[PDB]
Amino acid sequence: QQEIQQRTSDMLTAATQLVQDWKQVETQVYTEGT
Amino acid sequence: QQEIQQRTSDMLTAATQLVQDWKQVETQVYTEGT
Amino acid sequence: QQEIQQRTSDMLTAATQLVQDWKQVETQVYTEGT
Amino acid sequence: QQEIQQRTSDMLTAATQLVQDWKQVETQVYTEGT
Amino acid sequence: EVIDKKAFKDMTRNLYPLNPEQVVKLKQIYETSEYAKAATPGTPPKPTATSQFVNLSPGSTPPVIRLSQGFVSSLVFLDSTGAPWPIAAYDLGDPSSFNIQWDKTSNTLMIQATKLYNYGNLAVRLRGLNTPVMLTLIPGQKAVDYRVDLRVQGYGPNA
Amino acid sequence: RIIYYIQAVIPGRAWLIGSNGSTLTVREGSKIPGYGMVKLIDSLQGRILTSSGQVIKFSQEDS
Amino acid sequence: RIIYYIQAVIPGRAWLIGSNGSTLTVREGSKIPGYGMVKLIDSLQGRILTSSGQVIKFSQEDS
Amino acid sequence: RIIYYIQAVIPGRAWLIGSNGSTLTVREGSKIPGYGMVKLIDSLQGRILTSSGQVIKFSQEDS
Amino acid sequence: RIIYYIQAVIPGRAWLIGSNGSTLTVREGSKIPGYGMVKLIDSLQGRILTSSGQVIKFSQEDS
After folding, report:
1. Which of E110, E126, G22, G55 could join G18 in a cystine, given CB atoms 3.0 to 4.6 angstroms apart?
2. What DSSP line would sit under chain C, residue for residue?
3. Residues 6+ apart with CB under 8 A from C28
4. What is the H or E stretch that residue E127 is in?
5. Alpha-carbon gap, residue F4 to F19, rounded angstroms
6. Cβ of F35: how many Cβ atoms within 10 Å?
7. In angstroms, rounded to a whole number, what is the distance separating the alpha carbons of residues H6 and H17?
8. Is B9 helix (H, G, I), strand (E, B) or coil?
9. Calpha distance H6→H18 (Å, rounded)
10. What residues form DSSP beta bridges with H17?
11. Which residues pair with F16 in a beta bridge?
12. Farthest CA pair distance, chain H
């Protein structure tokens, strides 16, 4: 029974990092040459 | 009996703010244009 | 009985924020262009 | 019984974050080129 | 092997306490609350444009301007022929209830009311006149004046 | 006759405009030509009661 | 006749446009030529009830 | 006849393009020429239900 | 006939190149000329299943 609550806390830490990485979108870069 | 004395203190607070607002008269403003 | 007193105090916080927002009137802005 | 009050407090935290995100409106940006 | 299915569904409910159905229902609650907040009691005033003649006799009554809180009313001054009459100066009583914007040379005043039911008066001096023109300003009526054209009895610098 | 219309009303006074372009102001006890004596000034709902039974209101096209 | 369409509506008022290009604004009790009396201004769903039974709504191509 | 194709769809609206190059926008209750009345706008999967039984979808070469 | 070869594959899409130099992109349900309907896009191992029974893979000299 108590192994379910230990496994649930492990998955919540990993899922918070996965969702936070999917939020990040970097702005495009325009390079002008002459 | 004691609910009358509670109601009297609430009306005295509201009547003090109402009388103080009626005292305020703002000075006229003269605007010159050229 | 005590659930009425808990519900009433929640309505004072909501009504005070509603009345204070209705008092606010912003000054007009005149823009000159040349 | 007690699991209802635990679930209710979790939903209030998520609903407060959702409401203030809908309140935010960004100003338009005008770009002049020459 | 069956623990992994049990731990995944309880993790999902902690990560997302609101269903996609419940997010949609919460958005309808929020915009209905803003609709009741912005609604005005009674009926809103009718937006109108008017035109009056101003008599400088010592028997007549001063003209009336209808205002509304947060709205702009523009007053333009004309002579008896209809040409514009530029404004020299003005004097406003109770500046806590009304706000006036004016470029220093034109003939148009723009007045916004700040309070709901407080009324006052205003004095306007024109360029060629010695007699000042006196008005009264009452807000909170069933009509709001978007623009008032005022005919003044004399003759201005343009004719 | 001459039809009078309410232009602006506060508690106590009322400003009236006639079909001739004439402008009046009235109090609780006052004379209106062609109407008689003012009986009641009702600042809410825009009604003025007159001793002859006629009711002066806002104009239909300006309200 | 002349067909009227709702241009904008808030609680209380409604702005109408006609097939002639004429523009109107109406209240709860008001004059409409060719329709009669305003009976109910219902700001949600864009419906105006009229005493002759006709319903003034938003235009089909502008909604 | 004229074949219509879905160009973009959100909940509520849908933007359509025809074989003539004409562009339309439709709501839940709306008229489409040659098709009838919109019955259901289903924003997922790109399907629009019509009262005549035809289904308007995305184009085969543009999807 | 024309022989198609896999150029790049991700989950969902696949980019193809033909013997004529023509380039296509396909989804799960799509048409390929000379092959029929796409039945399964399997991003691992570079295999695409087709309704006619043929299998489109990477080119032998380019893999």
Report:
1. G22
2. -HHHHHHHHHHHHHHHHHHHHHH--PPP------
3. E72, E99, E101, E110, E112
4. none
5. 7
6. 21
7. 7
8. helix
9. 9
10. H5, H23
11. F6, F24
12. 28
Q: Are strands E98-101 and E87-92 parallel, antiparallel or unpaired?
A: unpaired
Token pair 């004399």 is at which residue?
Answer: E154
> Cβ contacts of residue G8 below 8 Å, gap of 6+?
G14, G15
Query: H or E stretch including A9?
Result: helix A2-23
Q: Which two tokens stand for residue G20?
A: 């002639």
E interface test, pick of B22, B23, B28 with most E CB neighbours within 10 Å: B28
Query: Which 15-74 residues of chain E touch chain G by CB within 8 A?
Result: 39-40, 42-44, 46-47
HSE, side-chain direction, 13 A CA sphere, residue B19: 6
Q: Which residues of A touch E14 (CB under 8 A)?
A: 8, 12
The C-alpha atoms of residue F20 and residue F18 are separated, in whole angstroms, by 5
**C-alpha angle with apex G52: G47 to G55, nearest 5 degrees?**
20
Neighbours of E, requiring at least 3 CB pairs below 8 Å, are A, B, C, D, F, G
Task: Record the tokens describing residue I14, joined without a space.
Answer: 């696949």
Query: CA triplet E130, E134, E137: central angle to 5 degrees?
Result: 160
Could you tell me which residues are beta bridge partners of residue H36?
H32
**Of F56, F7, F22, nearest in space to E136 by CA:** F7
Cα–chain-centroid distance for residue H50? Answer: 9
Length of chain I: 63
Phi, psi of H41 (to 5 degrees): -105, 115
Instruction: Tell me how far the alpha carbon of residue G3 is from its chain's centroid.
Output: 10
- CB atoms C32 and E103 under 8 Å: yes
CA F18 to chain CA centroid, Å, is 9
